[PDB]
Amino acid sequence: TGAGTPSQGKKNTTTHTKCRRCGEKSYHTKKKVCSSCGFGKSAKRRDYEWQSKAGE
Amino acid sequence: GRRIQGQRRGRGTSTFRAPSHRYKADLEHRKVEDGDVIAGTVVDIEHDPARSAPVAAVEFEDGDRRLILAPEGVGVGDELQVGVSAEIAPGNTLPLAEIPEGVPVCNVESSPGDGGKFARASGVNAQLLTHDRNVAVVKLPSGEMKRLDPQCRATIGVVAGGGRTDKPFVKAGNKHHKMKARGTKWPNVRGVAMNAVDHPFGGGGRQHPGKPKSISRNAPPGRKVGDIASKRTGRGG
Amino acid sequence: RSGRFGARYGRVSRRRVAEIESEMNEDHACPNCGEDRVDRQGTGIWQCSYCDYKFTGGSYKPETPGGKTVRRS
RNA sequence: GUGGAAGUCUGUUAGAGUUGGUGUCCUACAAUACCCUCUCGUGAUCUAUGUGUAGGGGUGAAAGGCCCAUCGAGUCCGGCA
RNA sequence: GUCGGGUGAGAACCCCGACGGCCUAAUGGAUAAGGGUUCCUCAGCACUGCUGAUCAGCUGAGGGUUAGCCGGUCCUAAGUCAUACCGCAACUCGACUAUGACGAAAUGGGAAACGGGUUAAUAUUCCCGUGCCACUAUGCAGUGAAAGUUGACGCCCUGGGGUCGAUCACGCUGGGCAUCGCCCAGUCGAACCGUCCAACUCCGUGGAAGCCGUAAUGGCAGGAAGCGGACGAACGGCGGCAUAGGGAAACGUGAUUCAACCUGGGGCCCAUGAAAAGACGAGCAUAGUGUCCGUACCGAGAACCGACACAGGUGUCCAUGGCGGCGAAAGCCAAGGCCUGUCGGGAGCAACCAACGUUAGGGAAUUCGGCAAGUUAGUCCCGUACCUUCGGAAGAAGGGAUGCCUGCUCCGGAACGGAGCAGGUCGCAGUGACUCGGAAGCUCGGACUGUCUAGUAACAACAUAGGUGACCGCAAAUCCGCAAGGACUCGUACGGUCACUGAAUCCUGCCCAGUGCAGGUAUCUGAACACCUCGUACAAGAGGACGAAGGACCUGUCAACGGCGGGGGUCUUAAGGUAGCGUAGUACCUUGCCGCAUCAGUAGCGGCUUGCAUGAAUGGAUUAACCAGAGCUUCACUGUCCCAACGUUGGGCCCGGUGAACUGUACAUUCCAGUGCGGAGUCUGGAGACACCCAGGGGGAAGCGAAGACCCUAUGGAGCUUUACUGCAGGCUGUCGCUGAGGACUCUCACUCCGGGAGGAGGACACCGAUAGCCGGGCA
RNA sequence: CGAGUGGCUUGCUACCUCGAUGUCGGUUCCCUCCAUCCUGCCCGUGCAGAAGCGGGCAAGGGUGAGGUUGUUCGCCUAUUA
RNA sequence: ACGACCGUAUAGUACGAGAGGAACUACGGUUGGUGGCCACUGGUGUACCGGUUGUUCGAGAGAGCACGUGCCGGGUAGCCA
Ligand SMILES: [Cl-]
Ligand SMILES: [Cl-]
Ligand SMILES: [Cl-]
Ligand SMILES: [K+]
Ligand SMILES: [Mg+2]
Ligand SMILES: [Mg+2]
Ligand SMILES: [Mg+2]
Ligand SMILES: [Mg+2]
Ligand SMILES: [Mg+2]
Ligand SMILES: [Mg+2]
Ligand SMILES: [Mg+2]
Ligand SMILES: [Mg+2]
Ligand SMILES: [Mg+2]
Ligand SMILES: [Mg+2]
Ligand SMILES: [Mg+2]
Ligand SMILES: [Mg+2]
Ligand SMILES: [Mg+2]
Ligand SMILES: [Mg+2]
Ligand SMILES: [Mg+2]
Ligand SMILES: [Mg+2]
Ligand SMILES: [Mg+2]
Ligand SMILES: [Mg+2]
Ligand SMILES: [Mg+2]
Ligand SMILES: [Mg+2]
Ligand SMILES: [Mg+2]
Ligand SMILES: [Mg+2]
Ligand SMILES: [Mg+2]
Ligand SMILES: [Mg+2]
Ligand SMILES: [Mg+2]
Ligand SMILES: [Mg+2]
Ligand SMILES: [Mg+2]
Ligand SMILES: [Mg+2]
Ligand SMILES: [Mg+2]
Ligand SMILES: [Mg+2]
Ligand SMILES: [Mg+2]
Ligand SMILES: [Mg+2]
Ligand SMILES: [Mg+2]
Ligand SMILES: [Mg+2]
Ligand code: NA
Ligand code: NA
Ligand code: NA
Ligand code: NA
Ligand code: NA
Ligand code: NA
Ligand code: NA
Ligand code: NA
Ligand code: NA
Ligand code: NA
Ligand code: NA
Ligand code: NA
Ligand code: NA
Ligand code: NA
Ligand code: NA
Ligand code: NA
Ligand code: NA
Ligand SMILES: [Sr+2]
Ligand SMILES: [Sr+2]
Ligand SMILES: [Sr+2]
Ligand SMILES: [Sr+2]
Ligand SMILES: [Sr+2]
Ligand SMILES: [Sr+2]
Ligand SMILES: [Sr+2]
Ligand SMILES: [Sr+2]
Ligand SMILES: [Sr+2]
Ligand SMILES: [Sr+2]
Ligand SMILES: [Sr+2]
Ligand SMILES: [Sr+2]
Ligand SMILES: [Sr+2]
Ligand SMILES: [Sr+2]
Ligand SMILES: [Sr+2]
Ligand SMILES: [Sr+2]
Ligand SMILES: [Sr+2]
Ligand SMILES: [Sr+2]
Ligand SMILES: [Sr+2]
Ligand SMILES: [Sr+2]
Ligand SMILES: [Sr+2]
Ligand SMILES: [Sr+2]
Ligand SMILES: [Sr+2]
Ligand SMILES: [Sr+2]
Ligand SMILES: [Sr+2]
Ligand SMILES: [Sr+2]
Ligand SMILES: [Sr+2]
Ligand SMILES: [Sr+2]
Ligand SMILES: [Sr+2]
Ligand SMILES: [Sr+2]
Ligand SMILES: [Sr+2]
Ligand SMILES: [Sr+2]
Ligand SMILES: [Sr+2]
Ligand SMILES: [Sr+2]
Ligand SMILES: [Sr+2]
Ligand SMILES: [Sr+2]
Ligand SMILES: [Sr+2]
Ligand SMILES: [Sr+2]
Ligand SMILES: [Sr+2]
Ligand SMILES: [Sr+2]
Ligand SMILES: [Sr+2]
Ligand SMILES: [Sr+2]
Ligand SMILES: [Sr+2]
Ligand SMILES: [Sr+2]
Ligand SMILES: [Sr+2]
Ligand SMILES: [Sr+2]
């Protein structure tokens, strides 16, 4: 069984969903954590300096 | 390289955990104020998943239903006693001090009141040898002479299920089923059969530990494999 | 006996299984009454079909050598 | 004679797999497909869903295998022009 | 698919009928996930659709999903999160312990709904009929009320009860067929209420010393059979429900085999097969309340994932439709679905290719190799070797039979079950198609089933049971974490950790010098602190004394790393290869030599064997069984071959429509020679050469596709190794702090551990902080 | 001992090619060379004959099937002008 | 577009003590190669005719399906060796 096309047919699990806090489809319904804004993980909003060029 | 199997164990992930949610109970002796005024009736005999040996369900006078580490010879209906004044008979528990020298005992406590630590496995038994006002001497299953507080509680008789080890598993499948009831990763891939990156013995054209197996006690985890601090090896001499 | 093992495993392994189980399945004298109606119920668990006495014993024998020692001493 | 054990046999039952054809395909139906043959099929079996283990770390009946077409150290962005 | 026809400006593919076909665990019915309006209607064809299109999953516009009793909602599972506590420089980080919450929509547990009717689209939701559950109120009854029971459970074999379905017999209703007299369909009717009870258990009676009983096991004076009784089942029987419903009509009755469902008996475990909410226990009348969320449709060779309307992938139930047969097998056929695994038209339709049928004689000569193809085949009877772990080998091998028809016998209660007999009789052929093993021997390997490189490796590799060695008495050994803490562990030596070998059988020699591990150790060596001398009004610093682990030194140990030679009739460096096996999957020499077998055998097998360079758990030998494992031989068979032929289906070719990509410095009709950076269509000399087009098989363009994988180079990279360099964790050990009282000692008060507690054990140690010496590819 | 020809073997060189000119053996299909194995015609002989042995002209045609081995080569078998 | 061989007569002759043993020439045939043809033999022949298994159309008759003939037997034209 190839890792490619044939293995793609087994994918019918819902993980990432519309996030209550930020509105992005990043709320992982299994972990109950938003990979985009951090909801469910932290009160503070998920943010990182590497999201932009260092001097900008 | 990569951490060896022995190091993966320590993390306690599911693969290495025992099926505790399927275990019955921890056959620890009952706690009595004093007097020995405690007796119960063997209500049933059950299989203990964690030890592959039988356990006896007992109902005590004061209304407490608990499983007990049963010796060989205990059956339904029988009456058991637990306390200083307990009768000297198989299945009864009392402090070593009350036990007569030369009597086979099991589920011996290490420290008075801990519930029992020694000789709990199938068909084994400790042998109470010397008595005293300060120290009770017991010969444990390994043949070691152990010095215990005469206050350490114990059960008369040998543990039920003796001889379990006399029959060969015969097939992998049987080993399999037993291993599924323990905190153990099985089957076992030999270190010499792995890649160098995975074990000190891995690598090489033909399989062989390109090094002596007797490893020092001071060796760090990841390197402490093979024959740990062996005082000797082989069968010779 | 080990006939269910066919030509597999080899002598020893299946010779002991036959002997162990041969003795295991024999009629055993019940400690309670005196009849030879004791059958194994599971690992180390024995019962008499006559008086219904359910008790603990060896894994494959109702009584073990070490077990018959506690009596003495 | 009865009985009906078995990591037991036959078996395209379901289901799982893949020895050979070095067949077909090779801007494919398909970034691993098609056909015939072949193997397993009461058990260390197969399978659904849920759940756990996370990057020098997992997981590995050990092939440096597998961890979302990527693994002798994943992916993303940043360090970075 | 074809012939007619319908609609339309337009019809091969939109619709109707007929004829012809395809699908049967699916190409049919219901659904989970996922999708998200794809569902229904009307109007459309610019877009999307492998051609066309009046069609549509497409475009425009409207419409559609109705619940006390179907899910959710409730419970708890593996397990998750939150708060508290503690750690951390810190946190959105981290382990334990408390508390709380979260965690199952087909497929865990669970109060209660059936039948029919209705719409373009919903429907146990609406409507009709009937019924049921929970709570609450009122009334009657009730003092019970919590013990127990249930929820609630593994694997294998099996009896009994029993519905649907299917089938048989006969009757009734309707249809079909028309030499017969047959063939098909229907013959209905729920939940619910009431009632019946087999099995199990038990009681009374009885009184078996050999009887009772089973498919089997089994039962009994501790009381068998028999007789009576208590308790007690179905999604089942029976009555109501039902001058409900449904049907054009009839609107049946018995039987056999019996899925569901109910209830028992047996066997297995070094394996023991959830929990909780809830329910019962615990009556009845009447009335009220029962909110909130889901509900369409697809569920796949076009509604999901795979960029696609993708031959892939994707769970559940329909597992009892007919013939067939052992069968949930093949083949054929219903119910139901479809002609959308969606471009057509034409040419006896050439070459060539993919799949396939048939081939005289020879029969593996083909080939690395019988690769490919074929041979055999189902069932019954006879019969069956070597060898063997006594199981097996084995369906060994080899031999014979096999249909139909007429009349019967036996087993069984019987089957539309099975086993035989006699006579008759047809074919080339009776497992007539389909289904359906080719067989035998020798050798190597691994014992076996099992595992593996998703995507070139299925093997001899990994695993395995078995054998062995090592560590550890649990305040342990081993392992994870910076810490708080944690796995092993509801575990305790018959344990579980770390390794090696790899079933059974017969065995497993010699070596402790080096290296590793471990133990010991007079003496030697061995750091820091404190101490002492010198030095400094102090300090830096120099030296001394004491000396832990460690090393020197000694001993133990090879199923510990490994080793078992050269020379002479000992030497290096400890020993100097024993049993076995041997030209090996190890033997260079080598096609060794002898033999077997063949016309001929670098092969294979047996023997010899000085073994370039076999050898005992780096396991040796051997081995029945097993194997999509490597090699060899034989019988059988055959288009593999001699040597090719004819045929079949789909392409190819021509026509309508649709309609890409690769590749392209330029020029280019070349050929023979030469030359040139020595491998030129293009330079030189000749030769040949009128342009264009179709089909072909691929000689050349050092053809296209990839900044060669091989090799080297770079004061490139990475993974891996070690007695490379340098460091870092970690372990051991001394010392200082915690730390107290009276080179050996006692105590208790810190601190640690056991204990529910009292109290017990230990104790200035241990843990922890700091530092010093040793080890330290575990890591950088 | 001396003198040459070839470019089938081997060695040497590093001239071409590392932004790839795919390897050995075999197979199939075509053209060629002669230093001729057979066939045609000749000369010599230690040529009676038959047959050998050596030599000359000559490339029209032919040069096959099999056993081991991947093998090339070769060893071997029966045929053959 | 033809190459080569065997055999017979020559002849048991020439030659030679014998053993052995030719040729010119005239014939018949085989083999390899080549071109063509199908009266003959052979193959094919999913034209066709027949036999027959399972199933469906109620039986009969006559048919479909079982892969592009279910299977088996025979085989015209044509094509072929
Ligand atoms: Cl074990
Ligand atoms: Cl639902
Ligand atoms: Cl029964
Ligand atoms: K090159
Ligand atoms: Mg316990
Ligand atoms: Mg497990
Ligand atoms: Mg192993
Ligand atoms: Mg490996
Ligand atoms: Mg390593
Ligand atoms: Mg899963
Ligand atoms: Mg509907
Ligand atoms: Mg399609
Ligand atoms: Mg033939
Ligand atoms: Mg050949
Ligand atoms: Mg084959
Ligand atoms: Mg009868
Ligand atoms: Mg060999
Ligand atoms: Mg194997
Ligand atoms: Mg692969
Ligand atoms: Mg395989
Ligand atoms: Mg082992
Ligand atoms: Mg063992
Ligand atoms: Mg072991
Ligand atoms: Mg091994
Ligand atoms: Mg192995
Ligand atoms: Mg040989
Ligand atoms: Mg040895
Ligand atoms: Mg080894
Ligand atoms: Mg090329
Ligand atoms: Mg390059
Ligand atoms: Mg390289
Ligand atoms: Mg490097
Ligand atoms: Mg504690
Ligand atoms: Mg390194
Ligand atoms: Mg060069
Ligand atoms: Mg010449
Ligand atoms: Mg002559
Ligand atoms: Mg020529
Ligand atoms: Na028997
Ligand atoms: Na295959
Ligand atoms: Na990494
Ligand atoms: Na009823
Ligand atoms: Na049937
Ligand atoms: Na179409
Ligand atoms: Na198997
Ligand atoms: Na040594
Ligand atoms: Na050796
Ligand atoms: Na196998
Ligand atoms: Na053929
Ligand atoms: Na070409
Ligand atoms: Na690397
Ligand atoms: Na030359
Ligand atoms: Na070649
Ligand atoms: Na010639
Ligand atoms: Na040869
Ligand atoms: Sr696939
Ligand atoms: Sr899935
Ligand atoms: Sr969180
Ligand atoms: Sr931030
Ligand atoms: Sr405990
Ligand atoms: Sr405890
Ligand atoms: Sr190694
Ligand atoms: Sr020894
Ligand atoms: Sr099996
Ligand atoms: Sr099978
Ligand atoms: Sr292959
Ligand atoms: Sr084939
Ligand atoms: Sr491919
Ligand atoms: Sr079966
Ligand atoms: Sr991948
Ligand atoms: Sr960058
Ligand atoms: Sr379906
Ligand atoms: Sr138009
Ligand atoms: Sr539609
Ligand atoms: Sr919940
Ligand atoms: Sr449910
Ligand atoms: Sr099951
Ligand atoms: Sr029955
Ligand atoms: Sr629906
Ligand atoms: Sr599909
Ligand atoms: Sr139909
Ligand atoms: Sr179309
Ligand atoms: Sr024919
Ligand atoms: Sr052959
Ligand atoms: Sr051959
Ligand atoms: Sr036969
Ligand atoms: Sr696999
Ligand atoms: Sr494969
Ligand atoms: Sr062995
Ligand atoms: Sr040593
Ligand atoms: Sr020897
Ligand atoms: Sr062996
Ligand atoms: Sr072409
Ligand atoms: Sr190039
Ligand atoms: Sr010449
Ligand atoms: Sr000649
Ligand atoms: Sr050779
Ligand atoms: Sr003649
Ligand atoms: Sr003569
Ligand atoms: Sr047909
Ligand atoms: Sr046949």
From Swiss-Prot, chain A:
Zinc finger (C4-type) residue numbers: 19-37
Similarity field: Belongs to the eukaryotic ribosomal protein eL37 family.
Subunit comment: Part of the 50S ribosomal subunit. Interacts weakly with protein L4.
Residues at which Zn(2+) binds: 19, 22, 34, 37
GO cellular component terms listed in the entry, alphabetical order: cytosolic large ribosomal subunit
Coiled coil: none
Polar residues bias: start-end ranges: 1-16
Any Pfam family matching the protein: Ribosomal_L37e
Database matches in PANTHER family: 60S RIBOSOMAL PROTEIN L37, RIBOSOMAL PROTEIN L37
Cofactor(s) it depends on: Zn(2+)
Full protein name: Large ribosomal subunit protein eL37
Biological function: Binds to the 23S rRNA.
Keywords carried by this UniProt record: Metal-binding, Ribonucleoprotein, Ribosomal protein, RNA-binding, rRNA-binding, Zinc, Zinc-finger
Cofactor binding note of this UniProt entry: Binds 1 zinc ion per subunit.
Gene Ontology molecular functions: rRNA binding; structural constituent of ribosome; zinc ion binding
Classification via InterPro entries: Ribosomal_eL37 (IPR001569), Ribosomal_eL37/eL43 (IPR011331), Ribosomal_eL37_CS (IPR018267), Ribosomal_zn-bd (IPR011332)
HAMAP family attached to this UniProt entry: Ribosomal_eL37
Domain of life: Archaea
Curated annotation (Swiss-Prot), chain B:
A cellular-component GO term for this protein: cytosolic large ribosomal subunit
MF term (GO), any: structural constituent of ribosome
Segments for region (Disordered): 199-237
Any one of the GO BP annotations: cytoplasmic translation
InterPro entries: NA-bd_OB-fold, Rib_uL2_dom2, Ribosomal_uL2, Ribosomal_uL2_arc_euk, Ribosomal_uL2_C, Ribosomal_uL2_CS, Ribosomal_uL2_dom3, Ribosomal_uL2_RNA-bd_dom
PROSITE patterns attached to this UniProt entry: RIBOSOMAL_L2 (PS00467)
SMART domains: Ribosomal_L2, Ribosomal_L2_C
Pfam families: Ribosomal_L2, Ribosomal_L2_C
Keyword Ribonucleoprotein in annotation: yes
Domain of life: Archaea
Gene3D superfamilies: 2.30.30.30, Nucleic acid-binding proteins, Ribosomal protein L2, domain 3
Leader peptide range in chain numbering: none
Consequence the record notes for mutating residue 199 to A/G: No incorporation into translating E.coli polysomes; ribosomes assemble normally. Significantly reduced translational activity
Keywords for the protein's UniProt record, in alphabetical order: Ribonucleoprotein, Ribosomal protein, RNA-binding, rRNA-binding
Family: Belongs to the universal ribosomal protein uL2 family.
Anything else known: This protein can be partially incorporated into E.coli polysomes in vivo, indicating it can replace the endogenous protein.
Function: One of the primary rRNA binding proteins. Required for association of the 30S and 50S subunits to form the 70S ribosome, for tRNA binding and peptide bond formation. It has been suggested to have peptidyltransferase activity; this is somewhat controversial. Makes several contacts with the 16S rRNA in the 70S ribosome.
Subunit structure: Part of the 50S ribosomal subunit. Forms a bridge to the 30S subunit in the 70S ribosome. Interacts weakly with protein L37Ae.
Protein name: Large ribosomal subunit protein uL2
Species whose genome carries this gene: Haloarcula marismortui (strain ATCC 43049 / DSM 3752 / JCM 8966 / VKM B-1809)
Biological classification of the source: Archaea, Methanobacteriati, Methanobacteriota, Stenosarchaea group, Halobacteria
